[model samples]
Target: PIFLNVLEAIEPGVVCAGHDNNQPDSFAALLSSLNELGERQLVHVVKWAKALPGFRNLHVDDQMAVIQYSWMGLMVFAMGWRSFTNVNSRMLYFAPDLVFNEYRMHKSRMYSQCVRMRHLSQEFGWLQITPQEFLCMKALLLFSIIPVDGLKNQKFFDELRMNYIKELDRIIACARKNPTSCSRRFYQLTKLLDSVQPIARELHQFTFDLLIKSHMVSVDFPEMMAEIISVQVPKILSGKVKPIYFHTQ
Candidate 1:
């Protein structure tokens, strides 16, 4: 019942990304919806953390500290999974109504980063990853952590982190038992973790910057998101939090 309880607790309340076929008309409305959607995701993030066995065992402040540092990374993973765009185009659809073209992406000063995110999604499509693997990877990301001021559960999370990686390997192994695809499929699935790490960092920073500088005063940021951003400052400035890049052969 514990796992089921956790699952139910973390189930998303609102659909943040999808093909809705309608969009807000004004910048302010668009910005407002973005925050609303992000805050909703943050709520799910908090619930997910509390549901995790190790996380639930920690002090409440420690639990919140971990969630605040990692919520944006979780958002990036969701965005990449939900993203539907062409490899050749510069458009990204965060939600059906919330789409941006190449020109708009560039005008917004996120063209290069957006392109990288698109490529990551394209890779996901090419791999044809199943929903189980998707959920497993999301859990892996959620459990992955860096040092935080009040977070004292690093060893707990670290142990669970490796266990998830082993679980991922088992999933890949079971899924690729066929002679023709076993080795190749294993490599492809595991290799994606490399890309996921760096892109997550970029997406988090971009979203955080937009919320902090562009709309800090004009728009009312959600209290949850505000807490996330506030806690991230010391981590970012300390350079303790950095992206993990991968090299090609």
Candidate 2:
């Protein structure tokens, strides 16, 4: 029920922050919302994983490692679903108070990647992905072991991954009328999973950079995210560990 709680916490149509045009107040507001959501999500992810049957059985260090590797992917999944629902509005909600239209983000090169991500979200909006698909995709992300270093029980995670994949397959089977259609849907879901990291990196770097540049200190920004973005993002994206993008037109 923990993952279910996490799902409900980020249930579709949930609203967080929106953008403001005012310069000084807007910057601070955006930072606050990002930090708030970041911490809130970290808690939900931890709780969700702990709720899993096998999660608590893992070594404590491995438990933390699983969260560390998957948190950003989970963040991207939640954010993408949120973006999918807002397709018509052409606005990407970075946080409750930090929404921005494509044009509003074009003012900075850092935001250029953000703009590209919005365009990607706009395309996904058309899929009108179902709640089952959304939740299952999240489960897959949480259970994933790829790029996670030094897992104590790879077999444990492998079984967990299959269980989640089976859940997704079950959802796809029920949602689609034909086997061919189900097969296609399954492929699409996996592909969607593949797309998470790039968007996640852009969003992570964009927000993390903004917070650091603003020198905004807040209790809301948890130590987990600080290490992940400050340490992990550079490590993963820079190809020092998990090789993971940039161009403008």
Candidate 3:
């Protein structure tokens, strides 16, 4: 209950994209709003992550690295959940003001990524995921990706990740007593979690390229998003950092 309380308490509320819906939707206008949205969400995500259970036990640099690396995945996961709840997964509910209709998805020039994200939202209903599961699963995501060489305090990070995994099992057990049934749910949930990494990876590429050509294209990547995309994302692309997937690729 204490763990659950902390997860629920630190969860950030809805963040808006600040898009001007009245403006004619150009590729540049749509993507600029997305960059702004990513910027706003980054502030709240940093706070929420630092407040997570045992997050402080990590080395300060390691803590920063974890949040930087995992932020997009966490954002995408939460966005998928939001899409499910707000629009019944009909479209990408990026924000209250910046919902992505089929046209918006196409105009945004991230239709491939948006399609995968909507599928993730649909999986929420398909697996019948519990609210508690979502909170814990999102927490686990913070620990999901790391450098191949490992963190400064790898032991603590590994232990913290294990504890979160155990908590997910504990939550699953509370609903389904039989071992087989609980394991079945675990399998599905983990597969769902594994699925998020690829989507996040694709989004990383999209954002990284967008930021690179931003000036010419009129896409403005705000400060924090720009820095992380520049510094942390290259590590992933170069195979220096990678996601810890539960299943074989």
Candidate 4:
């Protein structure tokens, strides 16, 4: 299978930029095949993913979790599934303005919080955030499905929820311990924590309860995702639409 061929090629290959091994090319080929195969049906992609050896061995919920969180992964399975279902299933087409307003509020709040934290950190003399730490902060706040927890573990998710708190603490300690010469990353960490984290947490909770739960409202995954996605539009256009009665004289 093209999938298997591509996976194997990349693994045995070396990482020289200009080097010509068939492996690097395989990745591009895989994407092309996937795009072509999935042009009309997403379910084929899903089937291919599920059929992968390691993937096939995972529990059903875990498999679904990966499908739900990973956009391309979901598209992979959706290739086959799409023939039988709606492709925009995850779109929130009809949510109320209040919900979207809240979501935006959460986003704004976190952004401001990060900036504030960065300023406070600077006051204490630590200037910048390291790349790893910056990445850590952004990932904690931005990425919805970090792969640390196996897709099915509820407890793992619970702990994962608080994973960034410790990271922030570690960032602070590094700043304090290495204050003077820490000229490299001058305030990036402080800015992110001060400006971002709180709102980010709020966004997480809001999304999980209101948005994610909405997606899972139905027993069928396709329907559930569709329902969630359908809400997005209505939320934005809520009060703007005029009431109309076609039969009115």
lDDT of each: 0.61, 0.61, 0.92, 0.33
Off by over 4 Å in 2: 1-32, 86-89, 107-109, 173-177, 204-222, 238-249
Can you give the TM-score per candidate against the true fold? 0.74, 0.73, 0.98, 0.25
lDDT of 4: 0.33
Model 2 lDDT, residue 159, Cα: 72
What would the per-residue lDDT of candidate 3 be over residues 186-243, giving only the tens digit for each residue? Answer: 9999999999999999999999888888888878888888999999999998899999
Better of 2 and 4 by lDDT: 2
**Candidate 4 C-alpha error for residue 98, in Å:** 30
Find the candidate with the highest TM-score and give its number: 3
- Candidate 1 yields a Cα-based lDDT of 0.61
Q: lDDT of model 1 at residue 225?
A: 69
RMSD of each: 4.7, 5.2, 1.0, 18.8
Give me candidate 4's TM-score against the actual structure.
0.25
TM-score of 2: 0.73
lDDT of 1 by residue, 64-149 (tens): 76667667667766667766332222356565556666654664466787788777677767788765566667666765555643
Candidate 4 vs. truth: CA RMSD? 18.8
- Deviation from native of the Cα of residue 227 in model 3, angstroms: 0.7
Clash count, candidate 1: 0
Off by over 4 Å in 1: 1-13, 16-29, 84-91, 101-108, 148-150, 173-186, 215-220, 242-249
